[PDB]
Amino acid sequence: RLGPYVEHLGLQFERIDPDRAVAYWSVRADLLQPHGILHGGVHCAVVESVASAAADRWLGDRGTVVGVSNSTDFFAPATVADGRLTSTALPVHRGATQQVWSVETVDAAGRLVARGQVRLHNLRL
Amino acid sequence: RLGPYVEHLGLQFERIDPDRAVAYWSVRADLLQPHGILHGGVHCAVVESVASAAADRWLGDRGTVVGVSNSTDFFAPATVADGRLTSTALPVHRGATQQVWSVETVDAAGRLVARGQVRLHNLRL
Amino acid sequence: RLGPYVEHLGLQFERIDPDRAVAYWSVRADLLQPHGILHGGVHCAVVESVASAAADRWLGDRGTVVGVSNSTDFFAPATVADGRLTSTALPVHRGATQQVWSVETVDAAGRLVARGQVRLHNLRL
Amino acid sequence: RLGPYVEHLGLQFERIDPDRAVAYWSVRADLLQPHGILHGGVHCAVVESVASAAADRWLGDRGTVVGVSNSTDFFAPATVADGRLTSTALPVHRGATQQVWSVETVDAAGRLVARGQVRLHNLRL
Incomplete structure (x- = not known):
């Protein structure tokens, strides 16, 4: 219900509030880069997905959000x-x-594996 | 030959030199976000892939490269x-x-659709 | 005691711990850009200064820190x-x-005026 | 004529066109951080200044530009x-x-010392 790329990432959203979104997912064989670790783009894509879900839920019926940048x-x-x-x-x-x-x-231990900042534009009605 | 996520992205490399890498690809139905445009994470993943290919080819047998950050x-x-x-x-x-x-x-016209800067670490032998 | 540019910025450090640094400062006439608001570089410089102070204090006698990037x-x-x-x-x-x-x-009200992420390298002894 | 902080930075503009701006400057004793090298914020401030000059000159009488972010x-x-x-x-x-x-x-040799990307908003008339 969140789009076909988000489905492919395997994200499972636990919470999507106007002030927080939380999703679980796992590293998979098809998501890896040549030396057996997660492709870095997957981290960026998950950051984009989870932030966009929250931004959309915060803007609500007032308009639509469009990704601007992702670091x-x-x-x-x-x-x-x-x-x-x-x-x-x-x-x-x-x-x-x-x-x-x-x-x-x-990860399960609270080790920070990746972190991203996502800027989005509000296209208001 | 570049990993399973790069295959899923549909990237086709035209050139991978120590000083430049070039890949072609296309927007696809499964790569879209809910409103019919390319998921932003796909742009990040392609930027990661194309830069990593070039960085790897520049480091050569001297070591291995690891993604650090992607903007x-x-x-x-x-x-x-x-x-x-x-x-x-x-x-x-x-x-x-x-x-x-x-x-x-x-795109085909030379319109800049996305642009990314990728920092990588050299793990030298 | 923190360098001549930090002095010019007018930063006054309230706390410099291995896990947090806090400094106060004010917008000034000489720090402005042509339309009467703070030059954006001043925000970056303060972010650099406050993060470097904390990073240095966390590394301690173990080595020295060098700025890498600032967003x-x-x-x-x-x-x-x-x-x-x-x-x-x-x-x-x-x-x-x-x-x-x-x-x-x-600001005094808790309004977030600027925010920066600072990556630094540890040059260890 | 470019503001008081730009004056303090010592920037001297050689060219400010709608498509390029070029400024010269030098490291100075008061611009250094504690270990004798240029404070990193100075690099950010110069990047902000030179990009803003170009952005302003490109927008012309059509509006005014406001810094958004600086990496x-x-x-x-x-x-x-x-x-x-x-x-x-x-x-x-x-x-x-x-x-x-x-x-x-x-520097004089063409060695890249620093590089920054500056996003600005057009406030149009």
Whole structure:
């Protein structure tokens, strides 16, 4: 119900509020880059997905949000062995025309694996 | 031969030199976000892929490269109607421990659709 | 005691711990850009200063830190009328070779005026 | 004629066209951070200044530009010994509401010392 690429990423949303969105997912064989770790683009795509879900839910019927930019740091290699990742988008700024959200991706232990900042534009009715 | 996620993205590399990498690809139905345009994470993933290919080819047998960060701007909506996209990674800095590459994604007309900067770490032998 | 540019910025540090640094400062006539608001570079410089102070204090005698990159968003115009700004650097990642800190600059009301992410390299002994 | 902070930075503009701006400047004792190299915020401030000059000149009488964000990488330490730096802003995207410019700061040899991407908003009449 969130689009076909989000389905392919395997994201499962636990919460989508106007102030927070949370999704679980896992590293998979088809999501890896040649040396057995998660392709970095997957981290960016998950950050984009989780922040966009939250931004959309915050704007509500007032308009539609369009991605502007995405800056993601990869802090640790993620593999299939690492189990279930949790990505949490938190608001940084939510105004008339712009939103910025911060998305942290952590493992079961709370180790920060990746983190991204997502700027989106509000297309208001 | 470039990994399973790169295959899923549909990237077709035309050139992978130590100083430039070029890949073609297209927007597809399964790569879209709910309102019929390319999911933004796909832009980031392609930027990551094309820059990593170039960085790897520049480091050669001297070591291996690991993604550090990825900052991608999305400048225009891309749809299935927009045809074939061309992503070109050009070097910004290539040193002992770090590389930075700049990747521009353009349409057939030369319209810049997205652009990303990719920082990678050199793990040398 | 923090360098001549930090002095020129007018930063006054309230706290410099291995896990947090806090500085106060104010918009001034000489820090403005042509239309009476704070020059954006001042926001970046303050973010750099406050994060570097914290990173240095966390690395301690173990080595020295060198700025790598600085990404600052400006969310609201700051003027002389806006009074005293408070910049707080919080750790995102602190590892062997790299540190990342997040610096928020707020006004008296808690309005977020600017926010920056600072990546630094640890040059260890 | 470009504001008081730009004056303090010592920037001297050689060219300000709608498609390029070029300024010269030098590392100075008061611009340094505690270990004798250029404070990183100075690099960001120069990137902001040179890109804003170009963006303003491109928008012309049509409106006014406001800084949105600034992402600067520092690639080599700059000192007083390094002589005259040249900062060149080139356009990445110039549209209805947004502009993005890329600013490279080089030394006399063409060594890239720092590079920044500056996003600005067009406030049109």
